[PDB]
């Protein structure tokens, strides 16, 4: 069910990502609302593309966790917390994380380009 | 800065691709303008997808450079030229290059399909 896992812990909630992914896309004011929904969808897909995550729902990266953003144990984050509480905790550092992800992908793409240059 | 590298050489300018990529997407006439901007964005993303470059900003291919399109040295193109001068030089051959890229990706996808068929 759409958002059925919203109150579920992060671990169990991560198993239903396709339900929300499918639901996100599925007068002049209504047409504006539809265009805005499309623009928001594309902004999220573009952002995933910038990070090298264009085809994945669960995308692993090379950016280390600082631990200052959140110093909780991994089992506490995934087994005891919900995604809403986690977002409330990380929203102060979300732009920092996004900037690091963009820089990491730019470095990875340059490194792959150089490896491909070697004959 | 958005287009800050426009007057910079191709080499240095290639390091800021995410700035323009993010800026490209970020009454009835205004709604038409927004829909057109979305359609143009999607046309570029579709074209990258056709070439097998859907998730990359710097995408390496298997199409050789003919040298008739431009016979400049690699250091001249990347260290002395800007992207605007380069586009002015290649616009006469851009459709040829795009056609070759599409054909190359179709051949690559068929070859991968056949390699995957081998058990």
């Amino acid at each position, epitope marked *: 069910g759409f958002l059925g896992a919203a109150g579920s812990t992060m671990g169990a909630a991560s198993m239903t990502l396709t339900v929300q992914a499918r639901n996100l896309l599925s007068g002049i004011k209504q047409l504006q609302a539809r265009v805005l929904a499309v623009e928001h969808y594309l902004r999220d897909q573009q952002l995933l593309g910038i990070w090298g995550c264009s085809g994945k729902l669960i995308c692993c990266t090379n950016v280390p966790w600082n631990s200052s953003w959140s110093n909780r144990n991994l089992s506490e984050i995934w087994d005891n917390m919900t995604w809403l509480q986690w977002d409330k905790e990380i929203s102060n550092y979300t732009q920092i994380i996004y900037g690091l992800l963009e820089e990491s992908q730019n470095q990875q793409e340059k490194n792959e380009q150089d490896l491909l240059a070697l*004959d | 800065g958005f287009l800050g590298a426009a007057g910079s050489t191709m080499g240095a300018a290639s390091m800021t691709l995410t700035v323009q990529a993010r800026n490209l997407l970020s009454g009835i006439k205004q709604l038409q303008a927004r829909v057109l901007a979305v359609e143009h964005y999607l046309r570029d993303q579709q074209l990258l997808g056709i070439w097998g470059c859907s998730g990359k900003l710097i995408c390496c291919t298997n199409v050789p450079w003919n040298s008739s399109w431009s016979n400049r040295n690699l250091s001249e193109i990347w260290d002395n030229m800007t992207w605007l001068q380069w586009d002015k030089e290649i616009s006469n051959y851009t459709q040829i290059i795009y056609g070759l890229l599409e054909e190359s990706q179709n051949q690559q996808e068929k070859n991968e399909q056949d390699l995957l068929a081998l058990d």
Partner: antibody
Amino acid sequence: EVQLVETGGGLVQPGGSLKLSCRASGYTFSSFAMSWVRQAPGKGLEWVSLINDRGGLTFYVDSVKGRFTISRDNSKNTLSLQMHSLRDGDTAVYYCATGGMSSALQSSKYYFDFWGQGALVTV
Amino acid sequence: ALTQPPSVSGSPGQSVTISCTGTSSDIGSYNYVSWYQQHPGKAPKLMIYDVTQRPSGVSDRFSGSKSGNTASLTISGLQADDEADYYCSAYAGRQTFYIFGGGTRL
């Protein structure tokens, strides 16, 4: 036209470690890949390691792949090599050299364009 | 390693060739075989880069060539000032980057 000077120690015990460092002058350090090449006292010279111009990519010869770390600092214009488990087979004069690779947008090299004079490391 | 003669000699003014023999994956497939001139007690200097090119500052006496899987350095106009240990260096690939031969004493 350019200067490249090796700094390093001498005799070490087997099983230890030693950091070598080279300083560059006369060319843009960040524009060229750097390598280490070594020559045993009685043998010819052989390639040891290669680092790209940015420093993100490193490559090693198999005989040292699990011990040596190659690193560069483009703000200091220096190249460092941290060696561990110096074996008797690793005794050699270690030269820094400019060349060996190019970052895709530059003309190819696959040669060592400039050389230093060499640090002598013994075991 | 690459195969080189342990010693080559000739009279002053003679054209002297130093062979470098490798396998199909070293000299044959990749046309990136360089030559270095090492004087005793000194670091090697680059004489030839690519199969046929000379760095600026190196005279035209040093002429490189390649045939099949064998590379060669021809030194015309032999003089005592150019006596040194010569080495060939070939690009082997992405898994193995460079292979050097033994020194040739001239």
